[PDB]
Amino acid sequence: YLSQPRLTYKTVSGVNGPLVILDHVKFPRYAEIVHLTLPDGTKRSGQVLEVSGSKAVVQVFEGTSGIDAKKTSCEFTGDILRTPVSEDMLGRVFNGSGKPIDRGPVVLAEDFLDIMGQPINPQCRIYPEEMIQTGISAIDGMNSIARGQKIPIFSAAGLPHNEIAAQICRQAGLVKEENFAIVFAAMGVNMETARFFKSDFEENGSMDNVCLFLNLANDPTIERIITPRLALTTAEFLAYQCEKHVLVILTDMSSYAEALREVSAAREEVPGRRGFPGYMYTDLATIYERAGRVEGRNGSITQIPILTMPNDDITHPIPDLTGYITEGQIYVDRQLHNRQIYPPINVLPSLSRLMKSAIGEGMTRKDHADVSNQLYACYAIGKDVQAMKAVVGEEALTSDDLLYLEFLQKFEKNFITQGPYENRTVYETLDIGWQLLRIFPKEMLKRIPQSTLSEFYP
Amino acid sequence: YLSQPRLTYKTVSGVNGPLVILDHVKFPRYAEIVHLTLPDGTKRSGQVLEVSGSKAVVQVFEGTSGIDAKKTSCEFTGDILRTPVSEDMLGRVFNGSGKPIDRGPVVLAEDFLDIMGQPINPQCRIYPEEMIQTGISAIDGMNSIARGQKIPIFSAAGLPHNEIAAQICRQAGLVKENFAIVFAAMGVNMETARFFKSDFEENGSMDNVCLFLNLANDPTIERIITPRLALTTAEFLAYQCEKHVLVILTDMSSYAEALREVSAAREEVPGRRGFPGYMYTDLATIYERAGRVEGRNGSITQIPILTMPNDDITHPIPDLTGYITEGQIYVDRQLHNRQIYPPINVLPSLSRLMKSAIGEGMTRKDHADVSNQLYACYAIGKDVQAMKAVVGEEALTSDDLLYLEFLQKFEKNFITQGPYENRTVYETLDIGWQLLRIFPKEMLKRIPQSTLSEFYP
Amino acid sequence: EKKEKQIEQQKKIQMSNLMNQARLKVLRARDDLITDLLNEAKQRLSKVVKDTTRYQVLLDGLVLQGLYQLLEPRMIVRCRKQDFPLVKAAVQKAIPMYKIATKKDVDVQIDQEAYLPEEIAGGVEIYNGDRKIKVSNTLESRLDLIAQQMMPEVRGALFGANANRKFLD
Amino acid sequence: TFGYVHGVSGPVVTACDMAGAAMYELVRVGHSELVGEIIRLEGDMATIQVYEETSGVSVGDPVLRTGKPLSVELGPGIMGAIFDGIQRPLSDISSQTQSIYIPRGVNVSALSRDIKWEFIPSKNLRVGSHITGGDIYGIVNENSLIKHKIMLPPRNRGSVTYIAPPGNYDASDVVLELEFEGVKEKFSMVQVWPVRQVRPVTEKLPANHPLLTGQRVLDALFPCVQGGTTAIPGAFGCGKTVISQSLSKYSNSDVIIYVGCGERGNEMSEVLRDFPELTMEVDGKVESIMKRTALVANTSNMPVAAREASIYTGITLSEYFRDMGYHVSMMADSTSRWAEALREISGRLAEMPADSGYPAYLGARLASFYERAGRVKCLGNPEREGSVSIVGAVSPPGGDFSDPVTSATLGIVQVFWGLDKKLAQRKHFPSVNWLISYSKYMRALDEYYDKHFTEFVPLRTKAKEILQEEEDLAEIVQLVGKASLAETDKITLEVAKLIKDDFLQQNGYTPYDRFCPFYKTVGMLSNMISFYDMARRAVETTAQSDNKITWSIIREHMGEILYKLSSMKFKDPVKDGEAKIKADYAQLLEDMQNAFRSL
Amino acid sequence: QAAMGSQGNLSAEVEQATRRQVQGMQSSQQRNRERVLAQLLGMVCEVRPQVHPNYRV
Amino acid sequence: FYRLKKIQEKKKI
């Protein structure tokens, strides 16, 4: 493969915030990459988005500043953005654009790949079945995660989702390769979060097996459009050319949606819901459909994004559309954090697709799923009793209501309450659940099959 | 000084709502004033809002109707709007645009001034500290009015805000003077205008009265210009004659409505409740012309009167009123249903200038702590009354009975006042002390012990 | 236990830092070797430029390539002053080829005022009529382009293939 | 070259003949030169935001071009002055014009060049040395308190060829000469720096030191740190301005930059009347805080566009004084004003609006602003360390917290102080909603307390749970009357009432409570928690007795002690030694123990 | 004290490892740099001028 | 409604 001498122009006919308009370009190509030289020696890059006649629309990842009309030059490559990809990217940190940010050199190009990736045949996917041990009673049990699944996290401002990310990182494992390769990317976050992540990884000795991309709040916002794909391409290369199991973390997709809004508003397209472009649904489908196993190979990808929450409206467009793509979701609650619970997780809004994963025949044990469902129902009824108590006085309470309330306080104070670094075996969690169940006399446990009730209740 | 003739165009390219599109305009100037001639003999005026190329846009103050593309003509003064100014405005009455309506002559201008005024340097302005004797216990005791300060009068439909304005301007004084009054209406019922004129005639102080009138039947757009002219006159008197000037505006709600109409015609970015997004700058421009200035004995005091759409206070009009002024008085319809002549709710009516004219040497040593204790006691009274409304009567304690008695006596004596009564500040503090004596000595946690020893018996 | 875990954590931190520094040094050394190889390539092509006979052939080829990439009625050429006798004949040979290839006429001129600086090993540049569009068909840019295309094969040759590369696809 | 005005619409100006123009370039418009900035280019036409009032500008007026973006000037004499939205020495302007008003197109140098200063060369500078920019090379006693230190800006280096001796020197006088590659560049005492850029630093450091504020509630519950970021949303009228002023008057910092955007000039005149009189003590020398403060005010009625310039100029000055090597903080007032200005500008430009009319990139700009704060290690071979704290004020419409401004703001700031209007309406002046406020810097300060106030750490914790239990019980009080609760519940209610009445209430205008030292606060908290402990122990011990004590019995037995508890806060810091206050508090504690023993 | 001793020892071990790797890489470059350079030089000689594929007449 | 008005306004060109 080769190409011919690249074209250069000096025909900047327009500038509108993060966009640039050119004219008299021969045979433009959609989604081509260009290189811009300002009147000074600075150099930048952009991507094409629209073509018609001889008009080329581009967007600058490095922001627009110092651009003029008669002096700016642009250069045209041949093909779409193809990025270097190597196994040595482990131990190497970069910025949002992928340029090395630490003191090391440019990545040696083991192989070039398309940033957009490639579609995968549905036939070739393999259903994920290997349940994962997380060492958190809240996650395991009611919301256990198979390897290959794509569960998100929901977090309002000022909640300790970062600590949850660190905890799941340190506690990664399997129910009994002995670990996972972590592909972590950050989108518009303050210095404290980056320091926390870097320091925590360094303390645990996991720099040998982690590749970081860092996009900070002070960097231009435009490169946020590219950054997640730069993470995922490396992830899938490690998952389908090295057979290495991968846990890929993303965070604060709200900023990615914001960048999409910037571009759409700059392009004067028809807005959809709350100023978000309509096709951002398809865009999120694109960025989330990069997990799951595949036959003939080994290894996979487990997708865990974090989602910052505008106010607390579950019915906001971003969480809603993420709810239609990701199989499940884990919910972080503000009230629990107000009541000083280190993993403030509300079981009620949470849900995952574990009905076929954690059964017991080779997995934890037979009574697992039934126990989980019974606990969930009991918690729901307990919250109902709590709501009832807020209306009338304590006199109207029966024995059942006192039992339910007492169960609520015990479950909240013991089961969910769990300090950091406190790995818990799955069997221990189920035993704690059994201890909670023993409080109620055996007759009111309706969901439980009779045989399990005789076997395990006493 | 322009010795050159004015141009007279006829290229009325288009018309749309309150706007007129002109073309082939040679070197148009921004915010320029244009006179108009209809196909018949009537005359009008306008202002420029935007220009581009040879095109231009002119908003018409009198509204658009029966405007021809081939008969009308328009004339350019080549200048920003200016207005005649003279001290002779005293004793005179005008309508909007300052045109005479008292059957009198055109104003013999001593000078000409810019309508838009000019910002005042923050270095040069001097903070106000001169307390003003209003005679009303709710305004001097629980609040304070300084010369140079600005403050509105919240109200609603049917409330007696006009009577409050009548009394405050009638018996204005100084604690121990001319107070040239200016009074501009905004699309109000004519009966209110006649009422105010009758009150001024009753007080027999027409030497000091300047009036600018605007009935609701006048064109809506002219109300946007109406207040600025009065403010310009006030500035002239303050900073070129050492006249202490008070100013009153009847209804800024009409101003907001007219500005909304103009903006809706101009398809501008909306905000809360479809209001124009830039009211902040505009209202700040209107209200900023107040205070005192170093080296000069003049001053300007502003007392606008606002009408809420309903009982709500979070409506954008009062909300944007709140940021500007350093205090506000509140009028409660509920108290008006109780037949109290000044139905004033003290609680929502803080004044941000209760520091520089209160204390010993200004009014008296024990002023601020008495005000604070009264505030706290009134709030506790409201709370316990709310509790009584649900729990009953037998469940209330002795302290609750004391607080209820305090409320009853406070509403009977303090706020209650005659249409012409004039209490000094000293007797107001005496009445407050009489009310406070009801409680035991130990319960006044808002007062230092020394004052308690000094004034309790 | 406080003192023990603190000591162990500090030890782990130091060990990890040492590993990171070692890996960074190794990668820096690899980059140094690659850059030295590129320098050798630059010297070798500088030697190659001196052979005038093949230089004229390559010059004609590159000129025709530029003419076919531009495709505009008005054209200008630029080159090192000392090589002008070659490029004028190059244009004279190339014009009929373009006329018979594109079935369209073209006026072509050579810049008698500006010339490529001496530091350029070889090549030419082209401009449209208005000097807004240009093409840099020089030896250096072509070298860089081919290198950016061909890094993976060079790495595979000079350091062997990746064992963990289980599948090409 | 020149340009010619093609059209005008409010604070925006379309122009022509701008082929060579570059964007974010300064421009001067009209016969009277008005500062401007480029925002948008098409062909040779352009778009210009004008920082001055627009009026009288006609079609075709000259438009002079300059080859620099917006920039400011740094050097001696900046402290104590006042500046407009652009750098303009307001006091010098009032003296110059000899008029009350500010002329629209006035032109005055940022700092007067006719004022000498006693410069002393750094002792370690020898001829031929290299400093590689960003390095101190002198010192100046611009005023009695702060010592202004001259530093070469970055992006500059060379060998020394001449250093001036010590002596008096006006501005614009050559002092240092360096020659890097055979080219000798001179320098003066005054440098320049682009506004929209960010001055680099050697490194960043984590927050590790508390920022005492003097206010009881903030320092006891939701403390901020130096280098930190804070936000104070509040309903329209809550005394936020007073919190800002009190913080400026009694901070731990060294230089304070008060930027009041969209505000009433009466507060500025009040500040000018108050700051000169109020003084403080450094190394035994008492001088006015006005010397260690700088002012930049942009009144609301001024042109709308200048607000953004004001906000940026504040942070640029504070960053310069961070490189200077001090701790500093700024009072950013009413960022929503900057948001509204941006909304107006975008609406005039006919962009695609976002939620509530504000343009989309508001959040991005707010992020780019806010990340510029923190503790840092600075350039310069002499080792220096500073910090910058931001204290923003927000005024959402209607007092609601659903507007996009606060929603975006809370996504960045680490500590939040919501203000509740109901408290303000009942004259509880430091109106802090303890139920919703939260601080993320609860960590990284436990060690400071370990070495100073180790006893204090659990006290505030206990206070939090008693308040939380009060809140949980309050609704049951509201819907169900009293006499249905145990004695523990009633005494906890009473303790919460005492906490609200005394520990939370602070009147900044009284002499005895204008500022609260920390020792006073911790003593009060210890007294209150000791009372709660003793009362709960008394009631629980007698819970199973036939003479179980009730709240009424306790109240009657030691009501005078309750009065003493309420009145302990009426003690001045001055005219009253710390030992005296501590002795009185210990004596009161002993009286309380005696009263509990007698029962 | 033992920890800093072991730190020095590990520094010696890792720097020895890096020296070994550097030597191996140098030999690997040496054995075929000439052939690779010849191949690249061949690559930068063949021009093949041609018209754009989409260009029409 | 305002968004729709603006998009129609721009579409009029």
JSON list of C-alpha atoms in Angstrom, two decimals, chain A residues 316-395:
[
{"chain": "A", "resi": 316, "resn": "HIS", "atom": "CA", "xyz": [-33.29, 12.27, 31.85]},
{"chain": "A", "resi": 317, "resn": "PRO", "atom": "CA", "xyz": [-32.44, 11.41, 28.21]},
{"chain": "A", "resi": 318, "resn": "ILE", "atom": "CA", "xyz": [-28.88, 10.12, 28.83]},
{"chain": "A", "resi": 319, "resn": "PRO", "atom": "CA", "xyz": [-29.77, 7.57, 31.55]},
{"chain": "A", "resi": 320, "resn": "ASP", "atom": "CA", "xyz": [-32.88, 6.53, 29.63]},
{"chain": "A", "resi": 321, "resn": "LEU", "atom": "CA", "xyz": [-31.03, 5.76, 26.42]},
{"chain": "A", "resi": 322, "resn": "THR", "atom": "CA", "xyz": [-28.26, 4.01, 28.33]},
{"chain": "A", "resi": 323, "resn": "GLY", "atom": "CA", "xyz": [-31.02, 1.93, 29.92]},
{"chain": "A", "resi": 324, "resn": "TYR", "atom": "CA", "xyz": [-32.18, 0.68, 26.51]},
{"chain": "A", "resi": 325, "resn": "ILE", "atom": "CA", "xyz": [-28.72, -0.60, 25.51]},
{"chain": "A", "resi": 326, "resn": "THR", "atom": "CA", "xyz": [-26.96, -1.90, 28.61]},
{"chain": "A", "resi": 327, "resn": "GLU", "atom": "CA", "xyz": [-28.56, -5.07, 29.91]},
{"chain": "A", "resi": 328, "resn": "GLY", "atom": "CA", "xyz": [-28.49, -3.84, 33.52]},
{"chain": "A", "resi": 329, "resn": "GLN", "atom": "CA", "xyz": [-27.56, -0.90, 35.75]},
{"chain": "A", "resi": 330, "resn": "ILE", "atom": "CA", "xyz": [-26.35, -0.37, 39.31]},
{"chain": "A", "resi": 331, "resn": "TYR", "atom": "CA", "xyz": [-27.71, 2.62, 41.19]},
{"chain": "A", "resi": 332, "resn": "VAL", "atom": "CA", "xyz": [-25.92, 4.86, 43.70]},
{"chain": "A", "resi": 333, "resn": "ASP", "atom": "CA", "xyz": [-28.28, 6.61, 46.11]},
{"chain": "A", "resi": 334, "resn": "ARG", "atom": "CA", "xyz": [-27.82, 9.96, 47.84]},
{"chain": "A", "resi": 335, "resn": "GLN", "atom": "CA", "xyz": [-29.92, 9.12, 50.91]},
{"chain": "A", "resi": 336, "resn": "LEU", "atom": "CA", "xyz": [-27.71, 6.20, 51.92]},
{"chain": "A", "resi": 337, "resn": "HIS", "atom": "CA", "xyz": [-24.59, 8.35, 51.59]},
{"chain": "A", "resi": 338, "resn": "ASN", "atom": "CA", "xyz": [-26.33, 10.90, 53.79]},
{"chain": "A", "resi": 339, "resn": "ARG", "atom": "CA", "xyz": [-26.85, 8.09, 56.31]},
{"chain": "A", "resi": 340, "resn": "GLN", "atom": "CA", "xyz": [-23.14, 7.18, 56.18]},
{"chain": "A", "resi": 341, "resn": "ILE", "atom": "CA", "xyz": [-23.03, 3.91, 54.24]},
{"chain": "A", "resi": 342, "resn": "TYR", "atom": "CA", "xyz": [-19.73, 3.53, 52.41]},
{"chain": "A", "resi": 343, "resn": "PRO", "atom": "CA", "xyz": [-21.22, 1.56, 49.49]},
{"chain": "A", "resi": 344, "resn": "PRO", "atom": "CA", "xyz": [-24.43, 3.63, 49.19]},
{"chain": "A", "resi": 345, "resn": "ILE", "atom": "CA", "xyz": [-26.30, 1.34, 46.78]},
{"chain": "A", "resi": 346, "resn": "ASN", "atom": "CA", "xyz": [-30.08, 1.09, 46.46]},
{"chain": "A", "resi": 347, "resn": "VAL", "atom": "CA", "xyz": [-30.99, -2.46, 45.50]},
{"chain": "A", "resi": 348, "resn": "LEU", "atom": "CA", "xyz": [-34.49, -1.53, 44.31]},
{"chain": "A", "resi": 349, "resn": "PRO", "atom": "CA", "xyz": [-33.67, 0.40, 41.09]},
{"chain": "A", "resi": 350, "resn": "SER", "atom": "CA", "xyz": [-30.77, -1.96, 40.33]},
{"chain": "A", "resi": 351, "resn": "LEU", "atom": "CA", "xyz": [-31.09, -4.99, 38.07]},
{"chain": "A", "resi": 352, "resn": "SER", "atom": "CA", "xyz": [-28.82, -7.30, 36.09]},
{"chain": "A", "resi": 353, "resn": "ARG", "atom": "CA", "xyz": [-29.05, -10.34, 33.83]},
{"chain": "A", "resi": 354, "resn": "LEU", "atom": "CA", "xyz": [-27.88, -13.03, 36.23]},
{"chain": "A", "resi": 355, "resn": "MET", "atom": "CA", "xyz": [-30.87, -15.37, 35.94]},
{"chain": "A", "resi": 356, "resn": "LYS", "atom": "CA", "xyz": [-28.82, -17.86, 33.90]},
{"chain": "A", "resi": 357, "resn": "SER", "atom": "CA", "xyz": [-25.32, -17.17, 35.27]},
{"chain": "A", "resi": 358, "resn": "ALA", "atom": "CA", "xyz": [-25.42, -17.80, 39.05]},
{"chain": "A", "resi": 359, "resn": "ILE", "atom": "CA", "xyz": [-27.33, -21.06, 39.54]},
{"chain": "A", "resi": 360, "resn": "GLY", "atom": "CA", "xyz": [-25.29, -23.45, 41.68]},
{"chain": "A", "resi": 361, "resn": "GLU", "atom": "CA", "xyz": [-24.35, -26.36, 39.42]},
{"chain": "A", "resi": 362, "resn": "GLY", "atom": "CA", "xyz": [-20.69, -25.40, 39.31]},
{"chain": "A", "resi": 363, "resn": "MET", "atom": "CA", "xyz": [-21.58, -21.90, 40.52]},
{"chain": "A", "resi": 364, "resn": "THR", "atom": "CA", "xyz": [-22.06, -20.79, 44.16]},
{"chain": "A", "resi": 365, "resn": "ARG", "atom": "CA", "xyz": [-24.93, -23.08, 45.22]},
{"chain": "A", "resi": 366, "resn": "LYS", "atom": "CA", "xyz": [-28.52, -24.04, 44.47]},
{"chain": "A", "resi": 367, "resn": "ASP", "atom": "CA", "xyz": [-30.29, -21.78, 46.98]},
{"chain": "A", "resi": 368, "resn": "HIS", "atom": "CA", "xyz": [-28.45, -18.66, 45.70]},
{"chain": "A", "resi": 369, "resn": "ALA", "atom": "CA", "xyz": [-31.00, -17.15, 43.30]},
{"chain": "A", "resi": 370, "resn": "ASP", "atom": "CA", "xyz": [-33.99, -18.00, 45.48]},
{"chain": "A", "resi": 371, "resn": "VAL", "atom": "CA", "xyz": [-32.29, -16.41, 48.48]},
{"chain": "A", "resi": 372, "resn": "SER", "atom": "CA", "xyz": [-31.55, -13.28, 46.47]},
{"chain": "A", "resi": 373, "resn": "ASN", "atom": "CA", "xyz": [-35.13, -12.94, 45.25]},
{"chain": "A", "resi": 374, "resn": "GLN", "atom": "CA", "xyz": [-36.53, -13.49, 48.74]},
{"chain": "A", "resi": 375, "resn": "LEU", "atom": "CA", "xyz": [-34.25, -10.79, 50.16]},
{"chain": "A", "resi": 376, "resn": "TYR", "atom": "CA", "xyz": [-35.32, -8.41, 47.41]},
{"chain": "A", "resi": 377, "resn": "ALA", "atom": "CA", "xyz": [-39.02, -8.98, 48.08]},
{"chain": "A", "resi": 378, "resn": "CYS", "atom": "CA", "xyz": [-38.49, -8.63, 51.83]},
{"chain": "A", "resi": 379, "resn": "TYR", "atom": "CA", "xyz": [-36.66, -5.33, 51.33]},
{"chain": "A", "resi": 380, "resn": "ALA", "atom": "CA", "xyz": [-39.45, -4.03, 49.10]},
{"chain": "A", "resi": 381, "resn": "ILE", "atom": "CA", "xyz": [-42.08, -4.88, 51.70]},
{"chain": "A", "resi": 382, "resn": "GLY", "atom": "CA", "xyz": [-39.89, -3.32, 54.38]},
{"chain": "A", "resi": 383, "resn": "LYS", "atom": "CA", "xyz": [-39.72, -0.06, 52.46]},
{"chain": "A", "resi": 384, "resn": "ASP", "atom": "CA", "xyz": [-43.50, -0.24, 52.12]},
{"chain": "A", "resi": 385, "resn": "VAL", "atom": "CA", "xyz": [-43.80, -0.56, 55.90]},
{"chain": "A", "resi": 386, "resn": "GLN", "atom": "CA", "xyz": [-41.38, 2.35, 56.29]},
{"chain": "A", "resi": 387, "resn": "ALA", "atom": "CA", "xyz": [-43.64, 4.47, 54.08]},
{"chain": "A", "resi": 388, "resn": "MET", "atom": "CA", "xyz": [-46.64, 3.34, 56.13]},
{"chain": "A", "resi": 389, "resn": "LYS", "atom": "CA", "xyz": [-44.98, 4.41, 59.38]},
{"chain": "A", "resi": 390, "resn": "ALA", "atom": "CA", "xyz": [-44.38, 7.93, 58.05]},
{"chain": "A", "resi": 391, "resn": "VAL", "atom": "CA", "xyz": [-48.17, 8.47, 57.99]},
{"chain": "A", "resi": 392, "resn": "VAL", "atom": "CA", "xyz": [-49.63, 7.02, 61.19]},
{"chain": "A", "resi": 393, "resn": "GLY", "atom": "CA", "xyz": [-48.16, 6.45, 64.62]},
{"chain": "A", "resi": 394, "resn": "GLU", "atom": "CA", "xyz": [-46.37, 3.42, 66.00]},
{"chain": "A", "resi": 395, "resn": "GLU", "atom": "CA", "xyz": [-49.57, 2.13, 67.63]}
]
